Structure formats: C-alpha cells, structure tokens
Amino acid sequence: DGQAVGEKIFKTAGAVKSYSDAEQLCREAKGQLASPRSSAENEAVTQMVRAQEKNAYLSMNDISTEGRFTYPTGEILVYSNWADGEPNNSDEGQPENCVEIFPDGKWNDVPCSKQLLVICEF
Template identity: 45%
Template sequence: MAFTTSSGRGDQGLDVLKYQVISIRQQFQSLKIAAEAQKKALVFSKGASCGDKIYVTNDQEVTYKEAVQICSKAGGQLASPRNRAENDAVLAISLEKKKRPFLGINDIQSEGSFRYINGKAIGYSNWYPGEPNNQYQNEDCVEMYATGEWNDKDCKEKRLVICEFF
C-alpha cells in the first residue's frame, strides 16, 4: 500500500526524502575526502599519524604543566604512546625537530606508579635501562630520548610539546 498525502500526490513525498538522503550521502562523502586530505597535509607539515591518532607539534618547548594545558586547549592531549607504533610516531617528530618531548605520562600522584594524564595506569612502556630512577627525588614526568626510550624527568624542565588528537 502506497503512502498518500491529503493532496493525493502518492509517493512524491517519499521520492523527495530519497533524493535528500542521496544528496546527504554525497555531501558526507565529499566531507570525508576533504577531511582525509587535511589530515594528510597536517601530518606532512608538522606531524605524524598512527591509526586514527594524529601527532602534531607547535615547536614550543615548555614545562610539563604548560604542555598539558597547550594540548588540552587545542582539543587534544599531550602525546601518550600506548604501543610501539604510537611511540615511533612521536619519535619521528622528536627526531625531525631534534628536541626531546614530554609524554603524557607521570607519577605525580604516587611515586613510582606511572599513569596517563587521565589517571589510568600505563600498559605500554619503553624505559631506558635503569629508568625510571627518580634522580634527585624530583623526577615525576616522562621525556623521550632520541632512541625512543623514556626517562623520568623534572616536570619544571622545558621539553618539546607534541599533542595527540583522535
């Protein structure tokens, strides 16, 4: 049984809806293509990607607290590698800039219990041999060496900002 309107136009309303759905699908596909092109351009200019995550730097060197704030204000978070591939993506930017970055990992709340910024325990780590060592009893943040390995570091030191977006 066909749907009819009070004007007796039958399936005309349904045809209009079908056309609108087709039009929306085409617009969505165009937006998807444009977004992918922008992602590639962003990664090409100042970043790296891994899966659905994009890693980008603003070339600034700041304290850990400032880095967390910068990334948060931009709508992301300080780079927090959760596997080897993500660690390598962050490392690629670090090597290109020839600067050590802070990672979104710390033991500020409980000494020796390194956690991501969201408070969850880290499930992946890449510590340099002998690290973390809390040298001088004030190393609560994590930096990345040029080898990709991690070192606990004083949060007041200045390191490269690399944010992750997903």
C-alpha cells in the same frame, strides 16, 4: 599536519615548555600531551623528536603515587619504553615525576619543570 597511527594523530608546532605549560597548550588545542600506548605510536612520536632535535614530554606522570606512572585518565601504563636504568626518580637526587622521550625512542623520568618539545595527540 602530523604523524598518525591508526586513528591517533601526533602534531607539534615546535613549542618548548614546562610540563604544566605543555599540558595547557595541548588541552587549549582540544587534544592532550603525546600518550604512546604501543610500539607503533612510540615510533611515530620518536620520528617527530628526531626531526625537531629536542626531547618531548609524554603525558604520563607519577605525581599521585610515586613509581606508578599514569595517563590523564589516572590509569596505569599499558606500554613503556624506559631507557636502561629508568625510571629512577633521581635528577642528581631530586624527584622526577614527568616523562621525556629521546630521539632513540627511549623514555626517561624528569623534573616536571624541564622545558621540552610539546607534541600533542588528537
């Protein structure tokens, strides 16, 4: 089961993984990491984060061009919900090229080595 908005379904099994491992899990399941493109999609992801009590990865990253967060298509964001002061590319100074979502629905850029809840979209 999962949470759905329109034709998109978000699912989790409560796995917690690094970004690269999370991406692999979703792809092997024939989906991709959660990619909220609207307020309504963001709220569905947020509900799951609240339930699981763990920040989740989103798909988007700025590994290609620093500060330009893109989907797995390489396209720029059509929606964002950054927490106040984010994205800051600064884990106590160190680069942050991946994105986590909080249980309040706001986003923070993080090191892609961080271990976070895996939510996939289908």
